[PDB]
């Protein structure tokens, strides 16, 4: 029996609403990679970088950055929410690193609407389990992508 | 072919039984087909014997065995016809079964090679094996008939309703073999997807017969065989077939509701079904009444139609006002047989003026009294009250009339003792006098009694 | 109802199927000659 | 009261006996509290996974064991608790409905498994899997259709509480006056997912919905 | 003719002196349907004593009609003036013999036919009315003189012993029990018929048979015949002692009021009849392993398991007929592979994989499906197991194009 957190929506559905409103396909970056190389899942390490690097340069990743501003009634509220978001993502990144958290896909990452905080759910894969699995082993301490790092502030991380 | 009919019977026998093997050389199938018909004509003249028809029975079966292995559907069909004329008594049947001929009879049942004339001759022979001795029916033929009936609708088989009618006939003289092969399960599943009234009556009667006599009830399970027909109404998401097209899914639900309704009515009209559906312990009737109180809208409308048909009450018209639904139930409403073209007055006066019988027992009132008492004891009256005060505006009107008819049906047919916990409406009155309960509900019950009040006046006037 | 003995049940089975079958098979396979 | 009920419901005998000893001691000073806990615990676990939910998960795992691991002794033990819960009788309309639609096939398929334990013929086991797979296909076609549940259909004992002295789960501290369960909403919604979680809404003693 | 019923139900003045004589001339019409309708509306008219007295004084000829006419002639015995006219040419003594041998049991068929016509959708070749047909034993007890004859012939002793000792095994001796329950219930529909029926203490026997009877059809018949006993105030008191209630009002007033009776009676508790004793269910009383570690080609780099000399198409003919033994390690490892795929096809878990594995054998080795011994083994397995119909047609059709030369050679020789 898990308690229900109010005023929170998952990151994946948050981006989905913004893209569909702007007549933007959900998986434009994914369609580009398959168009350039249909056998993406079988490419070697060096070839996957070429396809991946090409996709991130042909699409500007700022969906989350603009999303948080159109949902702010004023500019004073917008700045306050951004400060909480930046220093709430940093706390869970370092704490999650020690615990060994993995499988942090967008459906398991939730953002608070009223405070801008970051909430993590589904603590199933812990203690470096996902890194040592034979099926698609992830080799990153935590989730820090171009979409998240482009929304905390203009100067970077 | 030239019918000899001149030489001795053994001499006429020798030819066709030599051109039935033929070593698959030097003989055409057309000659074999015409030679087989010679055997049938010959067997009609000389009676079944081993002293006048040359060889013994066991020798004749051997050569006839190499007639069902042919590649021509016309030859195989004529070969089966010969056996039907040869099997007369149990002595021959046990001789035809020892040679394992049943491995080939069941072969012709399921080949599906545009041979509907060959399959009829195979099924017509099975009906003879049942008649001669039903206690020696092979298990090889039985397993073929179950398969063609169990999964014979998705493949568009046209001899599907002709094989179920053979299982039922066999299930009356030899339930032992049918029960092992799951043949009593097939009949239960067929009535679910068979929406023909006359056929649906016949199938359910066969199973209820097995639950009638005390030495046959051992072949039917307790609370899972017969109560399967109640699944479409008790289960809110019923899937009868694991593989079906999703296009007609909505139409499939309506088809199941109609077919299941004809089975529930068909099991409440037999003495072996009333006592089995109204057992003192957990029973199907308590599940059928208990599901009526759940605030569902698709099930509630379906169950009300079943209740009307069980008591054989006239159905009102769909509406949201009580007056419109009351004028459509009066016994004096116009009918189409009252015109000048049809019976002018004699047809009309039959249903208006009362019968001149005040002492003759009405044997149908006795049946309706027992059914009504069974539902009242289980809690039908309390279930209907919940429906009236907690449903849609067009469902409550259909339930208010049913309550009115049942109360009128019960103050003239039920005895004195059963009428003491009847005409008091404890649940209804308490709701309509309490101010604590939500105001909206209070007047729904109060208006319901007001609407039900006018029902008595319509019965008070009578037909006019 | 009193559909109890097999004498009337067999008559009910082989009459409803013949009369109410759309395909022309039950009238051909349920011939009374085979008894 | 919450951790003890979990321990008292464990399969292990050592945990089951030891947990019950503490519970009966608590019955001395506070007997009505523990009885409400068992009733609430037994009903919430019933609502969480239904009879057709248990069979769908058990059959899928059992099929993998028999055809992927070729283990027979491991397949029977998976389906034994599932078949044991059907002999105690349905306690609700939903369980009664399941026992009617799928009851005959499951009960007969158990018998074909009791003949394989003795005869040892492989055909008996194969004939038993013809009924398990037939039922498994029918259940799989109606799981997506499950989108809402009525308390009267699944568990009538929950909407007839109307008062409880047991606190709302997950909220208890010694320095704050306590909140108790007043009532449970008569309808709960199922979230469409692979696990199909439910949204159960309680009613606090101070008029706050949880 | 159909319009003479509206003149009957409307209480036309003096209908009993000009209407009855107009229904007797209509009785001799040429069309059978017209005459058969004149019998229906005359049976309805007979329920008034003034009308019934009119018919007796007219003495019409109803013998030339069928069973419908016979039943209308049996109502004459209920009137003292009509009994003396019939029991004067020696007629009731002929009916008593003729109502005991032949069609005392046929009265059950008449009862069952109307019920099956009312609500069965049977149609032997809107709420209806099902009225109890006239019974000779039930009309002879209206007066003392008629009741006296039914006692000297001593039929009650024969009927009573048939109820206390029922044999509910044969389907033909059960109908004799129904033929006696329907005859005992008609003798109890009158006060003068209850005097000689309660002296043998038979009502408690029927009540026991109405709650503990193995055949549920008899348990429903006793419900109907107990209603006929409740047609009098004296009969409703007996049923009340045994916890059975009844309706104590006629039908002429459909609005009963607290202070001849219609025949209806129900137990005080309806669950006193629906109890049935439980009866237990009748069911209550290798290469397969090795192949999964290797391949078909690896192994290559008697096989019939359940093949005994009674369930084979060819081997069974060695002794009875006089056949010759069949003739012939590369072919012994293919029989196992063909069979083990058949069993795996009986679960339908992965049908496509098993069908593919069976088509390859018929391609690489098309002569392995050319032995009758394998066909018998496969056919014997197709009976015990359960296969789906599409999978059943896949088998038994792989063997279509075979010669089976061994049978033909031996069959030709033995017959010649
Ligand atoms: Zn052999």
Give me the DSSP letters along B212-256: TSTTTGGGS-SSSSGGGGGHHHH-SS--S-SS--STTHHHHHHHH
How many CA atoms lie within 13 Å of E331's alpha carbon, on the beta-carbon side?
12
Q: How far is the CA of E320 from the centre of ligand 1 (A)?
A: 14
**Chain position carrying tokens 């499906």:** E369
Cα–Cα distance, A41 to D191 (Å, whole number) = 32
Name the closest residue on chain A to residue D209, using Cα atoms. A4
Cα–Cα distance, A137 to A141 (Å, whole number) = 12
Residues of A at the annotated binding site? 3-5, 10, 108, 110, 121-122
Query: Using the beta-carbon criterion (under 8 Å), do E111 and C6 form an inter-chain contact?
Result: no
Closest to D123 (Cβ–Cβ): which among E346, E348, E349?
E346
**How far does the CA of residue D92 sit from the closest CA of chain E (Å)?**
23
CB atoms within 10 A of CB B444: 18
**Chain position carrying tokens 């239960």:** B188
Q: Are B396 and B387 in contact (CB under 8 A)?
A: yes
Helical (H) or strand (E) element with D190: strand D187-190
Q: Which is it for strands D148-150 and A109-112: parallel, antiparallel or unpaired?
A: unpaired
Rg (CA), chain A: 17
What are the distances in angstroms from CA A148 to CA A67, A90, A143, A152, E173?
12, 11, 9, 7, 90
Distance of CA B151 to the CA centre of its chain: 18
Buried b / exposed e over B40-51, threshold 16 CB at 10 Å, is eebbeeeeeeee
The phi and psi torsions of D187 (rounded to 5 degrees) equal: -145, 135
In chain B, residues with a C-beta closer than 8 Å to the C-beta of D150 are 294-296
Q: How far is the CA of E374 from the centre of ligand 1 (A)?
A: 7
Q: Are A28 and A147 in contact (CB under 8 A)?
A: no
Cα–Cα distance, E34 to E32 (Å, whole number) = 5
Residues of A at the annotated binding site for Mg(2+)? 108, 122
Name the closest residue on chain E to residue D108, using Cα atoms. E283
Tokens of A57: 């340069």
Name the closest residue on chain D to residue A3, using Cα atoms. D170
Q: How far is the CA of E315 from the centre of ligand 1 (A)?
A: 4
Q: How far is the CA of B75 from the centre of ligand 1 (A)?
A: 26
Residues 6+ apart with CB under 8 A from B223: B282, B283, B284, D99, D100, D103
Subunits with 3+ C-beta pairs closer than 8 A to D? A, B, E
Burial class (CB in 10 A: 0-12, 13-18, 19+), B165: buried
What are the distances in angstroms from CA B104 to CA B9, B69, B96, B112, B141?
28, 8, 11, 15, 9
Given CB atoms, is E381 within the 8 Å cutoff of chain D? yes
Q: Are B418 and E267 in contact (CB under 8 A)?
A: no
In chain D, residues with a C-beta closer than 8 Å to the C-beta of A3 are 170
Closest to C12 (Cβ–Cβ): which among B127, B162, B205?
B205
Buried b / exposed e over D113-130, threshold 16 CB at 10 Å, is bebbeeeeebbbbbbbbb
Query: Using the beta-carbon criterion (under 8 Å), do B151 and E281 form an inter-chain contact?
Result: no
DSSP SS3 for D86: coil
Given CB atoms, is E119 within the 8 Å cutoff of chain C? yes
Cα–Cα distance, E321 to B336 (Å, whole number) = 74
Tokens of D78: 């998976």
Per DSSP, B292 falls in state G
Given CB atoms, is C19 within the 8 Å cutoff of chain E? no
Given CB atoms, is D89 within the 8 Å cutoff of chain B? yes
Burial class (CB in 10 A: 0-12, 13-18, 19+), A151: buried
The phi and psi torsions of B411 (rounded to 5 degrees) equal: -90, 0
Given CB atoms, is E171 within the 8 Å cutoff of chain C? yes
Query: Using the beta-carbon criterion (under 8 Å), do E349 and D123 form an inter-chain contact?
Result: no
**How far does the CA of residue C4 sit from the closest CA of chain B (Å)?**
7
For the four alpha carbons of D182, D185, D186 and D188, in that order, the dihedral sign comes to: negative
Tokens of B363: 């044997």
For the four alpha carbons of A138, A139, A144 and A146, in that order, the dihedral sign comes to: negative
The phi and psi torsions of A112 (rounded to 5 degrees) equal: -75, 135
Q: How many CB pairs under 8 A join B and E?
A: 255
Query: Can you give the length of chain A in residues?
Result: 157
Cα–Cα distance, B162 to B149 (Å, whole number) = 9
Tokens of D103: 């009851």
For the four alpha carbons of E201, E205, E208 and E210, in that order, the dihedral sign comes to: negative
Tokens of C10: 């067999």
Residues 6+ apart with CB under 8 A from A12: A105, A106, A107
Query: Using the beta-carbon criterion (under 8 Å), do C9 and B206 form an inter-chain contact?
Result: yes
What are the distances in angstroms from CA D89 to CA B226, B302, D99?
17, 27, 9
Cα–Cα distance, E367 to C30 (Å, whole number) = 41
Cα–Cα distance, B385 to E213 (Å, whole number) = 37
Tokens of B447: 């208006």
Residues 6+ apart with CB under 8 A from E145: E80, E83
Farthest CA pair distance, chain E = 111
Query: Using the beta-carbon criterion (under 8 Å), do D152 and B236 form an inter-chain contact?
Result: no
3-state helix, strand, coil in chain B (%, to 5): 65, 0, 35
Cα–Cα distance, B405 to B412 (Å, whole number) = 11
Tokens of D40: 């609430």
Distance of CA B145 to the CA centre of its chain: 18
Cα–Cα distance, E277 to E275 (Å, whole number) = 7
Cα–Cα distance, B82 to B33 (Å, whole number) = 11
In chain B, residues with a C-beta closer than 8 Å to the C-beta of D93 are 234, 287, 290-291, 294
Q: Are E414 and B59 in contact (CB under 8 A)?
A: yes
For the four alpha carbons of E379, E384, E389 and E391, in that order, the dihedral sign comes to: negative
Resolution, Å (one decimal): 3.7
Cα–Cα distance, B442 to B421 (Å, whole number) = 23
For the four alpha carbons of B256, B259, B261 and B267, in that order, the dihedral sign comes to: negative
Cα–Cα distance, E42 to E22 (Å, whole number) = 11
Q: Which of E347, E383, E392 to mutate to test binding with chain D, by most D CBs within 10 Å of its CB? A: E347
Residues 6+ apart with CB under 8 A from B11: none
- What stretches of E2-74 show up as alpha helix (H) in DSSP? 6-9, 15-18, 20-25, 32-45, 49-56, 67-73
**How far does the CA of residue C2 sit from the closest CA of chain E (Å)?**
6
Q: Are B54 and B14 in contact (CB under 8 A)?
A: yes
Q: Are E127 and C13 in contact (CB under 8 A)?
A: no
Q: Are E246 and E236 in contact (CB under 8 A)?
A: yes
Query: Using the beta-carbon criterion (under 8 Å), do C29 and B158 form an inter-chain contact?
Result: no
Of E75, E63, E10, E33, the residue nearest E19 (C-alpha)? E10
**Chain position carrying tokens 């909403």:** D185
Query: Can you give the length of chain B in residues?
Result: 464
Distance of CA E160 to the CA centre of its chain: 24
Query: Using the beta-carbon criterion (under 8 Å), do B123 and C4 form an inter-chain contact?
Result: no
Of A130, A153, A142, A131, the residue nearest A90 (C-alpha)? A142
Residues 6+ apart with CB under 8 A from E399: E369, E375, E378
Query: Using the beta-carbon criterion (under 8 Å), do D126 and E347 form an inter-chain contact?
Result: yes
Burial class (CB in 10 A: 0-12, 13-18, 19+), D75: buried
Given CB atoms, is C1 within the 8 Å cutoff of chain E? yes
> Using alpha carbons only, what angle is made at residue E31 by residues E29 and E34, rounded to the nearest 5 degrees?
75
Query: Can you give the length of chain E in residues?
Result: 416
Cα–Cα distance, E219 to E358 (Å, whole number) = 58
* Residues in the 5 Å CB sphere of ion ligand 1: E 312, 315, 373
**Ranges assigned E (strand) in E218-262:** 244-246
Long-range (24+ apart) CB contacts under 8 A made by B301-307 are B301/B395, B301/B398, B302/B233, B302/B257, B302/B261, B303/B233, B304/B395, B304/B398, B304/B399, B304/B402, B305/B261, B306/B233, B306/B261, B306/B264, B306/B265, B307/B402
Given CB atoms, is D199 within the 8 Å cutoff of chain A? yes
Cα–Cα distance, B371 to A140 (Å, whole number) = 73
Cα–Cα distance, E29 to E34 (Å, whole number) = 7
Cα–Cα distance, B76 to B60 (Å, whole number) = 16
D195 annotated as a binding-site residue: yes
């Amino acid at each position: 029996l898990i308690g229900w957190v109010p005023h929170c929506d998952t990151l994946h559905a948050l981006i989905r609403d913004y893209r569909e409103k702007k007549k933007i396909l959900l998986n434009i970056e994914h369609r580009i990679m398959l168009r350039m190389a249909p056998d993406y899942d079988h490419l070697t390490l060096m070839q996957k970088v070429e396809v991946f690097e090409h996709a991130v340069n042909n699409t500007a990743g700022d969906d989350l950055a603009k999303l948080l501003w159109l949902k702010s009634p004023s500019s004073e509220v917008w700045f306050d929410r951004r400060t909480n978001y930046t220093r709430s993502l940093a706390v869970m990144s370092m704490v999650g690193y020690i615990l060994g958290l993995g499988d942090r896909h967008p459906s398991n990452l939730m953002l608070d609407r009223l405070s801008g905080k970051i909430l993590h759910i589904d603590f199933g894969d812990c203690f470096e389990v996902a890194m040592t699995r034979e099926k698609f082993p992830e080799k990153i301490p935590f989730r820090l992508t171009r979409m998240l790092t482009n929304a905390m502030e203009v100067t970077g991380l | 072919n030239v019918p000899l009919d001149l030489t001795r019977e053994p001499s006429d026998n020798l030819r066709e039984i030599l051109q039935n093997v033929a070593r698959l050389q030097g003989v055409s199938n057309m000659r074999k087909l015409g030679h087989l018909n010679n055997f049938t004509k010959l067997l009609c003249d000389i009676g079944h014997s081993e002293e006048k028809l040359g060889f013994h029975y066991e020798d004749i079966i051997i050569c006839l065995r190499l007639a069902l292995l042919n590649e021509a559907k016309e030859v195989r069909a004529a070969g089966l016809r010969a056996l039907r004329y040869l099997i007369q008594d149990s002595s021959i049947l046990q001789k035809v079964l020892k040679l394992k001929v049943d491995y080939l009879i069941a072969r012709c049942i399921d080949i599906q090679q545009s041979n509907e004339v060959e399959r009829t001759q195979a099924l017509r022979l099975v009906r003879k094996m049942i008649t001669v001795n039903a206690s020696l029916f092979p298990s090889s033929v039985t397993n073929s008939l179950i398969a063609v009936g169990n999964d014979g609708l998705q493949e568009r088989d046209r001899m599907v309703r002709a094989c179920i009618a053979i299982i039922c006939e066999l299930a009356l003289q030899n339930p032992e073999v049918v029960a092992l092969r799951g043949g009593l399960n097939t009949i239960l599943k067929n009535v679910i997807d068979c929406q023909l009234s006359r056929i649906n009556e016949a199938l359910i009667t066969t199973i209820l017969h097995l639950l009638n006599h005390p030495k046959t009830r051992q072949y039917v399970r307790a609370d899972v065989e017969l109560e399967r027909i109640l699944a479409p109404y008790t289960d809110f998401h019923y899937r009868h077939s694991p593989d079906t097209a999703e296009g007609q899914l909505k139409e499939d639900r309506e088809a199941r509701f109609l077919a299941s309704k004809m089975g529930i009515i068909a099991t409440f009209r037999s003495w072996a079904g009333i006592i089995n559906l109204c057992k003192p312990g957990n029973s199907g009737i308590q599940s059928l009444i208990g599901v009526l109180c759940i605030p569902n809208m698709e099930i509630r409308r379906g169950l009300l139609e079943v209740l009307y048909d069980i008591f054989r009450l006239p159905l009102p018209v769909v509406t949201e006002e009580f007056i419109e639904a009351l004028l459509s139930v009066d016994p004096g409403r116009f009918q189409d047989s009252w015109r000048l073209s049809d019976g002018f007055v004699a047809a009309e006066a039959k249903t208006i003026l009362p019968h001149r019988a005040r002492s003759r027992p009405d044997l149908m009132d006795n049946y309706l009294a027992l059914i009504l008492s069974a539902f009242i004891r289980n809690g039908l009256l309390e279930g209907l009250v919940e429906v009236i005060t907690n449903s849609d505006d067009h469902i409550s009107v259909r339930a208010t009339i049913l309550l009115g008819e049942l109360l009128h049906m019960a103050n003239t047919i039920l005895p004195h003792s059963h009428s003491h916990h009847l005409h008091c409406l404890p649940t209804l009155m308490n709701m309509a006098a309490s101010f604590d309960i939500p105001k909206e509900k209070r007047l729904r019950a109060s208006a319901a009694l007001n609407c039900l009040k006018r029902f008595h006046e319509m019965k008070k006037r009578g037909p006019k | 109802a009193f559909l109890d003995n097999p004498t009337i049940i067999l008559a009910h089975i082989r009459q409803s199927h013949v009369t109410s079958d759309d395909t022309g098979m039950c009238e051909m396979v349920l011939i009374d000659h085979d008894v | 009261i919450y951790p003890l009920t979990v321990a008292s419901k464990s399969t292990t005998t050592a945990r089951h006996n030891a947990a019950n000893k503490i519970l009966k001691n608590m019955c001395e000073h506070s007997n009505t509290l523990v009885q409400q806990a068992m009733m609430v615990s037994e009903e919430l676990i019933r609502v969480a996974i239904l009879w057709h939910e248990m069979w769908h998960e058990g059959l899928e795992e059992a099929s993998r064991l028999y055809f992927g691991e070729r283990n027979v002794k491991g397949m029977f033990e998976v389906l034994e608790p599932l078949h044991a819960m059907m002999e105690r009788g349905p306690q609700t309309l939903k369980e009664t409905s399941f026992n009617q639609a799928y009851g005959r096939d499951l009960m007969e398929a158990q018998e074909w498994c009791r003949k394989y334990m003795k005869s040892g013929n492989v055909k008996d086991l194969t004939q038993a899997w013809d009924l398990y797979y037939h039922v498994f296909r029918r259940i799989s076609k109606q799981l997506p259709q499950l989108t809402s549940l009525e308390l009267q259909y699944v568990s009538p004992k929950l909407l007839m509480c109307r008062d409880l002295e047991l606190a709302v789960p997950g909220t208890y501290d010694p320095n704050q006056p306590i909140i108790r369960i007043q009532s449970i909403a008569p309808s709960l919604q199922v979230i469409t997912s692979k696990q199909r979680p439910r949204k159960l809404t309680l009613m606090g003693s101070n008029g706050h919905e949880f | 003719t159909k319009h003479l019923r509206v003149l009957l139900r409307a209480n036309v003045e003096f209908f009993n002196n000009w209407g009855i004589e107009l229904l007797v001339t209509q009785l001799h019409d040429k069309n059978k349907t017209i005459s058969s309708e004149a019998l229906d509306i005359l049976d309805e008219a007979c329920e008034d004593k003034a009308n019934l007295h009119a018919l007796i004084q007219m003495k019409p000829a109803l013998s030339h009609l069928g069973d419908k006419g016979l039943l209308l002639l049996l109502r004459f015995l209920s009137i003292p003036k009509g009994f003396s006219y019939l029991n004067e040419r020696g007629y009731v003594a002929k009916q008593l013999e003729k109502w005991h041998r032949e069609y005392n049991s046929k009265y059950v068929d008449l009862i069952e036919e109307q019920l099956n016509e009312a609500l069965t959708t049977y149609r032997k070749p809107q709420r209806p009315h099902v009225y109890l047909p006239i019974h000779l034993y039930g009309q002879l007890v209206h007066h003392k003189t008629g009741c006296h004859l039914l006692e000297v012939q001593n039929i009650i002793t024969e009927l009573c012993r048939n109820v206390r000792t029922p044999d509910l095994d044969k389907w033909e001796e059960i109908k004799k029990l129904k033929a006696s329950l329907w005859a005992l219930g008609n003798i109890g529909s009158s006060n003068w018929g209850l005097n000689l029926l309660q002296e043998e203490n038979v009502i408690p026997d029927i009540l026991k048979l109405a709650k503990q009877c193995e055949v549920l059809s008899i348990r429903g018949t006793c419900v109907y015949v107990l209603g006929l006993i409740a047609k009098t105030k004296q009969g409703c008191d007996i049923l009340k002692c045994h916890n059975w209630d009844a309706v104590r009002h006629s039908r002429k007033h459909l609005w009963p009021v607290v202070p001849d009776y219609i025949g209806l009676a129900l137990p005080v508790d309806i669950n006193d009849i629906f109890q049935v004793k439980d009866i237990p269910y009748f069911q209550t009383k290798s290469f397969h392993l090795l192949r999964q570690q290797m391949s078909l080609t690896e192994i290559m780099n008697t096989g019939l398991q359940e093949h005994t000399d009674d369930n084979c198409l060819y081997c069974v003919c060695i002794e009875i007929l006089g056949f010759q033994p069949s003739n012939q390690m590369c072919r012994i490892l293919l029989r196992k592979e063909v069979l083990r795929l058949v069993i795996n096809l009986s679960s339908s878990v992965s049908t496509k994989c098993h069908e593919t594995g069976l088509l390859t054998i018929k391609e690489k080795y098309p002569q392995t499906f050319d032995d009758i011994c394998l066909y018998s083994e496969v056919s014997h397995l197709l009976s015990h197991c359960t296969f789906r119909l599409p999978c059943r047609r896949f088998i038994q059709e792989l063997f279509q194009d075979v010669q089976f030369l061994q049978m033909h050679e031996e069959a030709e020789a033995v017959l010649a």
